[PDB]
Scaffold this active site. Structure first.
Site, mmCIF file in Angstrom:
data_model
loop_
_atom_site.group_PDB
_atom_site.id
_atom_site.type_symbol
_atom_site.label_atom_id
_atom_site.label_comp_id
_atom_site.label_asym_id
_atom_site.label_seq_id
_atom_site.Cartn_x
_atom_site.Cartn_y
_atom_site.Cartn_z
ATOM 1 N N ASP A 15 0.694 -1.415 0.045
ATOM 2 C CA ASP A 15 0.006 0.027 0.072
ATOM 3 C C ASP A 15 0.786 1.255 -0.048
ATOM 4 O O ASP A 15 0.665 2.000 0.993
ATOM 5 C CB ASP A 15 -0.872 -0.060 0.969
ATOM 6 C CG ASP A 15 -1.960 -0.895 1.031
ATOM 7 O OD1 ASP A 15 -2.155 -1.598 -0.069
ATOM 8 O OD2 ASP A 15 -2.559 -1.778 2.382
ATOM 9 N N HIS A 25 2.647 4.296 -2.833
ATOM 10 C CA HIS A 25 2.701 5.107 -4.007
ATOM 11 C C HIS A 25 4.063 5.948 -4.265
ATOM 12 O O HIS A 25 4.563 6.485 -3.138
ATOM 13 C CB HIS A 25 1.449 6.099 -4.166
ATOM 14 C CG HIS A 25 1.468 7.022 -3.229
ATOM 15 N ND1 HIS A 25 1.952 8.249 -3.379
ATOM 16 C CD2 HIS A 25 0.900 6.909 -2.007
ATOM 17 C CE1 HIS A 25 1.837 8.793 -2.355
ATOM 18 N NE2 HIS A 25 1.084 8.224 -1.533
ATOM 19 N N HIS A 38 9.981 15.698 3.499
ATOM 20 C CA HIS A 38 9.524 16.547 2.696
ATOM 21 C C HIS A 38 10.078 17.851 3.001
ATOM 22 O O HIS A 38 10.769 18.518 2.193
ATOM 23 C CB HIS A 38 7.765 16.573 3.200
ATOM 24 C CG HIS A 38 6.960 15.827 2.256
ATOM 25 N ND1 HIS A 38 7.160 15.723 0.811
ATOM 26 C CD2 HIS A 38 6.005 15.087 2.837
ATOM 27 C CE1 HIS A 38 6.160 14.842 0.390
ATOM 28 N NE2 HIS A 38 5.518 14.340 1.326
HETATM 29 N N1 LIG Z 1 2.059 11.098 1.750
HETATM 30 C C1 LIG Z 1 1.362 11.771 0.970
HETATM 31 O O1 LIG Z 1 -0.005 12.011 1.354
HETATM 32 O O2 LIG Z 1 1.472 11.658 -0.478
HETATM 33 P P1 LIG Z 1 1.929 12.996 -0.898
HETATM 34 O O3 LIG Z 1 2.937 13.774 0.000
HETATM 35 O O4 LIG Z 1 2.523 12.720 -2.499
HETATM 36 O O5 LIG Z 1 0.733 13.971 -1.379
HETATM 37 C C2 LIG Z 1 -0.498 13.475 -1.950
HETATM 38 C C3 LIG Z 1 -1.728 14.179 -1.950
HETATM 39 O O6 LIG Z 1 -1.368 15.265 -2.537
HETATM 40 C C4 LIG Z 1 -2.618 16.104 -3.181
HETATM 41 N N2 LIG Z 1 -2.329 16.797 -4.389
HETATM 42 C C5 LIG Z 1 -1.676 16.232 -5.398
HETATM 43 N N3 LIG Z 1 -1.687 17.376 -6.254
HETATM 44 C C6 LIG Z 1 -2.457 18.359 -5.981
HETATM 45 C C7 LIG Z 1 -2.604 19.740 -6.367
HETATM 46 N N4 LIG Z 1 -2.483 20.063 -7.713
HETATM 47 N N5 LIG Z 1 -3.502 20.482 -5.721
HETATM 48 C C8 LIG Z 1 -3.957 19.940 -4.429
HETATM 49 N N6 LIG Z 1 -3.686 18.635 -3.740
HETATM 50 C C9 LIG Z 1 -2.914 17.891 -4.409
HETATM 51 C C10 LIG Z 1 -3.553 14.744 -3.430
HETATM 52 O O7 LIG Z 1 -4.745 15.040 -3.483
HETATM 53 C C11 LIG Z 1 -2.897 13.762 -2.252
HETATM 54 O O8 LIG Z 1 -3.888 13.519 -1.092
HETATM 55 FE FE LIG Z 2 3.879 13.026 1.625
#
Ligand SMILES: NC(=O)OP(=O)(O)OC[C@H]1O[C@@H](n2cnc3c(N)ncnc32)[C@H](O)[C@@H]1O
Ligand SMILES: [Fe+2]
Ligand SMILES: NC(=O)OP(=O)(O)OC[C@H]1O[C@@H](n2cnc3c(N)ncnc32)[C@H](O)[C@@H]1O
Ligand code: NA
Length: 566
Positions: A12, A14, A118
């Protein structure tokens, strides 16, 4: 120090990716999906991406001082799954399988807190000694937002927001609800400008000067049967949206299409019908983040803002943050999403080992590149005829100036979701028909999707409202009077554009091509979209590029020093 940072895990997960730092320098960095050709790098250790990093730097695992992982994975297992069963040695066998990664002994294994990773990916590579840090994503181990202070090489957390109140999950859920899909929030962002906002609270958010509140959801809600609050927030948002919005969720349809000879997936409704929902979600997101940014900037007494985490991909929101009275400077890395926590975990660990991290410096080109011989071998395998122009950049500029679509595969592949002139499809910025042509004929996109421009950094001050560096297309900006109508193909509905500025040092070939193009059409500016067909990651190898070239009705492919025409 040599430090390999990783993200991606077989259960699970990505956005698997790998990054290698050597003495604070990025020696190699790439996303798993580029190698697998499967979008998003789901449910896998970053096997191929890590194998690329090590080959690139001419290293083995035994040459590593440390391996870093961009989540506190043991803590997620203890907390959510009732126990972390792995020795460091067993964890490494999963992350770096011995059949691909032979090793005499085990490098020290480090697990880095997700939001720290991050933050590291923003701060350490920004080239700024201090600033405020704002991490907004779907969810790390627990928190969905982190406010922190970066100074003197240190990152200190000030406050966090519990997962149930995630802006990322929120945005993703809306995106899914529209039928654009939760895996394509960027499309929701594109749709937003076509809609009208009536009420940016969505009857759920309450905004204040420090951020936002969600009284739709217990902020301490927790899924007892998973390791994030995604399913909880999914049920709450879907139920709430269905109550307050005039349209029910858009449904996906799977039917056999005799023209394609396959079961294909489609939406029951046109997502364009939800444009008001999109506009409203975007407004709600921006307003919440604005407060958050104001809040961390004031508390730290900083005027430079660092943003990362998935929501940090919202270029529209980012552009507006930058014009805000509380902000002087912004840095957002090209890898704001989870892609970037391999790099960030490595940086956190390297800084701990006493290394100093070099600024990224206006390029995201850290992936694999290919020699002329390697490109030629890929070419000859296909039996296509090709040329090796005396001046590739001149010829490409002329092709573009004339209204042709040129594929452009050069140097190290870019890392992150944006094509930046390493793996790009190029076209005229000045053409009032180019946008419709590329959307409908080339990239199989909805008519309402905008395109972005690449331009010399040397003329960007005259073209764009703001005179700053825009190396990553991670930010939108308004277009000036003279140009708002000069560059029809790269302007959006709200009069914004999402620019890449190009320095000569960051990309000499691309810079020279744009310079050449400038002599022909007045402005060294072109349309630059990602080089890929709808269902695939951006092309990486010369075989990838050739394959995509063959099925798209584009005019030419400039791959290495070689030029292929249709
Ligand atoms: N750990 C973890 O959560 O993964 P991560 O840090 O990669 O963030 C993923 C999130 O970025 C959000 N997200 C991606 N692109 C986006 C955009 N253009 N605008 C708003 N939210 C966004 C998307 O909806 C998702 O919920
Ligand atoms: Fe994240
Ligand atoms: N180089 C490269 O990456 O090309 P890409 O076409 O894949 O651009 C990425 C995304 O930015 C979106 N986009 C482009 N211009 C935009 C704007 N002014 N405002 C919002 N989104 C935009 C665009 O619709 C697409 O979804
Ligand atoms: Na400002």
């Amino acid at each position: 120090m040599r430090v390999l940072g990783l993200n991606g895990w077989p259960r699970d997960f990505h956005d698997a990716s790998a990054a290698l730092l050597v003495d604070g320098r990025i020696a190699a960095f790439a996303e798993e999906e580029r190698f697998t050709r499967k979008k998003h790098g789901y449910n896998t250790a970053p096997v191929q991406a890590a194998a690329f990093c090590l080959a690139q730097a001419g290293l083995t695992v035994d040459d590593l001082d440390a391996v870093a992982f961009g989540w506190d994975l043991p803590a997620m297992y203890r907390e959510r799954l009732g126990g972390w069963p792995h020795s460091d040695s067993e964890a490494l066998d999963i992350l770096l399988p011995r059949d691909v990664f032979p090793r005499r002994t085990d490098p020290p294994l480090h697990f880095v807190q997700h939001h720290l990773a991050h933050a590291a990916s923003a701060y350490y590579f920004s080239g700024e000694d201090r600033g405020a840090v704002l991490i907004v994503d779907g969810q790390g181990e627990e928190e969905c937002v982190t406010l922190a202070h970066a100074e003197g090489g240190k990152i200190t957390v000030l406050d966090t927001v519990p997962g149930a109140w995630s802006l990322g999950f929120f945005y993703e859920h809306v995106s899914e609800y529209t039928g654009l899909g939760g895996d394509n929030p960027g499309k929701l962002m594109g749709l937003a400008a076509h809609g009208t906002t009536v009420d940016e609270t969505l009857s759920a958010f309450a905004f204040d000067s420090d951020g936002y509140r969600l009284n739709l959801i217990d902020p301490q809600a927790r899924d007892p049967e998973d390791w994030d609050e995604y399913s909880v927030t999914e049920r709450a948002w879907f139920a709430h949206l269905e109550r307050i919005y005039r349209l029910p969720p858009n449904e996906f349809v799977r039917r056999y299409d005799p023209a394609k000879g396959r079961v294909v997936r489609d939406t029951r409704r046109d997502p364009y019908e939800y444009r008001d929902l999109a506009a409203t979600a975007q407004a709600a997101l921006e307003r919440a983040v604005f407060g958050l940014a104001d809040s961390v900037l004031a508390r730290t007494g900083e005027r430079t803002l660092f943003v990362a985490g998935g929501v940090g991909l919202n270029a529209t929101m980012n552009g507006k943050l930058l014009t805000r009275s509380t902000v002087d400077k912004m840095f957002v890395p090209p890898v704001a999403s989870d892609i970037g926590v391999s790099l960030g975990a490595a940086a956190a660990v390297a800084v701990e080992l006493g290394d100093r991290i070099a600024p990224m410096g206006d390029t995201a080109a850290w992936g694999p590149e290919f020699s002329p011989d390697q490109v030629r071998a890929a070419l000859d395998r296909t039996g296509l005829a090709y040329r090796e122009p005396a001046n590739l950049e001149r010829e490409v500029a002329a092709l573009i100036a004339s209204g042709k679509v040129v594929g452009w595969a050069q140097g190290r592949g870019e890392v992150g979701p944006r094509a930046l002139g390493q793996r790009s499809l190029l076209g005229s910025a000045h053409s009032p028909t180019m946008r419709d042509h590329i959307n409908l004929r080339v990239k199989d996109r909805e008519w309402w999707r905008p395109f972005a421009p690449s331009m010399l950094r040397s003329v960007s001050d005259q073209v764009l409202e703001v005179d700053a560096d825009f190396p990553y297309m991670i930010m939108t900006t308004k277009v000036r009077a003279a140009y708002a109508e000069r560059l029809p193909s790269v302007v959006h509905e709200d009069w914004s554009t999402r620019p890449q500025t190009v320095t000569e040092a960051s990309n000499p070939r691309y810079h020279r091509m744009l310079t050449e193009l400038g002599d022909l059409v007045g402005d060294p500016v072109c349309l630059n979209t990602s080089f890929n067909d709808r269902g695939e990651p951006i092309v990486s190898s010369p075989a990838d590029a050739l394959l995509t070239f063959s099925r798209l009705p584009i005019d030419a492919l400039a791959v290495g020093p070689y030029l292929v025409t249709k």
